[PDB]
Amino acid sequence: PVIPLDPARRPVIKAQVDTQTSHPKTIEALLDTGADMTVIPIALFSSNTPLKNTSVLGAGGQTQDHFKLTSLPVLIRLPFRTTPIVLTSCLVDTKNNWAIIGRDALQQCQGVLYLP
Amino acid sequence: PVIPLDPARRPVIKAQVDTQTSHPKTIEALLDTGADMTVIPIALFSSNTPLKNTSVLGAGGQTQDHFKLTSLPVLIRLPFRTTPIVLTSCLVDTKNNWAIIGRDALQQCQGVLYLP
Numbered sequence: 001p002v003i004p005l006d007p008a009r010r011p012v013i014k015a016q017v018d019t020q021t022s023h024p025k026t027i028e029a030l031l032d033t034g035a036d037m038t039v040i041p042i043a044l045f046s047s048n049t050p051l052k053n054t055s056v057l058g059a060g061g062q063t064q065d066h067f068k069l070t071s072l073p074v075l076i077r078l079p080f081r082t083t084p085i086v087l088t089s090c091l092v093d094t095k096n097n098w099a100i101i102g103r104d105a106l107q108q109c110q111g112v113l114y115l116p
Numbered sequence: 117p118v119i120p121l122d123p124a125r126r127p128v129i130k131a132q133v134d135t136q137t138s139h140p141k142t143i144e145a146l147l148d149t150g151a152d153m154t155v156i157p158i159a160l161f162s163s164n165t166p167l168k169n170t171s172v173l174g175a176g177g178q179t180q181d182h183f184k185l186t187s188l189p190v191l192i193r194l195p196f197r198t199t200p201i202v203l204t205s206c207l208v209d210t211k212n213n214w215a216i217i218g219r220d221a222l223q224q225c226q227g228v229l230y231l232p
């Protein structure tokens with residue numbers, strides 16, 4: 001589908017996220033061309049899985065306690081599409097409720113940005 | 117043009133920005149569909165130049181200090197189209213000097229996100 005760009009209406013999508021730590025979950029995620037890596041809420045991971053340490057830069061400066069890093073690949077499926085997007089590693093938001101589809105996933109699904 | 121999406125290569129673009137407080141300048145801006153409002157470097161604005169205090173959400177939570185708000189509209193020109201993008205107001209990065217094209221500007225040039 002063609003998704004219009006609107007400052008008042010964020011470009012969201014419903015995507016099934018398989019973290020391979022629990023059961024695959026359909027969540028609402030922001031489509032983000034500014035993001036390099038995909039951000040997945042920590043609420044989808046099991047309580048006993050190890051996550052790597054890292055630091056990420058953003059608006060309110062950088063941080064090292066806000067984001068973590070997956071130990072296992074994350075599979076992401078789109079609404080009617082059936083083959084999953086395979087991300088070797090992706091960011092994990094441990095504080096807020098953040099689901100962000102980055103360019104890493106937007107590449108495998110042939111996603112592009114068009115300017116008339 | 118059709119801008120491809122790649123995690124290893126940011127969707128940057130050259131744009132001419134007029135802050136109406138000084139000489140119009142050329143910057144390299146990041147095409148960001150996740151940004152509600154456009155962010156321009158404070159290095160564009162003259163030294164005086166009243167700017168408003170504002171609060172912005174991003175990476176390391178919310179920030180009371182990083183971003184300011186323009187008092188006057190911001191003229192933005194792109195390589196292709198001859199007519200300029202007119203934003204009523206946009207964000208100003210004081211800490212760093214990021215150039216980020218949000219959906220506010222992408223709407224006025226009718227930019228869309230295409231997912232096959």
Ligand SMILES: O=[N+]([O-])c1ccc(S(=O)(=O)N(Cc2ccccc2)[C@H]2CNC[C@@H]2N(Cc2ccccc2)S(=O)(=O)c2cccc([N+](=O)[O-])c2)cc1
Pocket residue numbers: 032034035036037038039056057058059060091100102148150151152153154155172173174175176216218
């Ligand atoms: O207009 N806004 O509300 C608005 C909000 C937020 C921003 S923003 O944080 O600077 N800034 C821009 C930006 C771009 C590149 C690098 C850092 C920041 C945001 C906007 N999109 C990228 C970035 N981040 C996500 C996000 C999206 C919407 C709202 C808040 C935060 S981020 O940082 O979590 C995610 C962030 C950064 C990097 C990665 N990653 O995978 O590498 C993922 C700008 C404008």
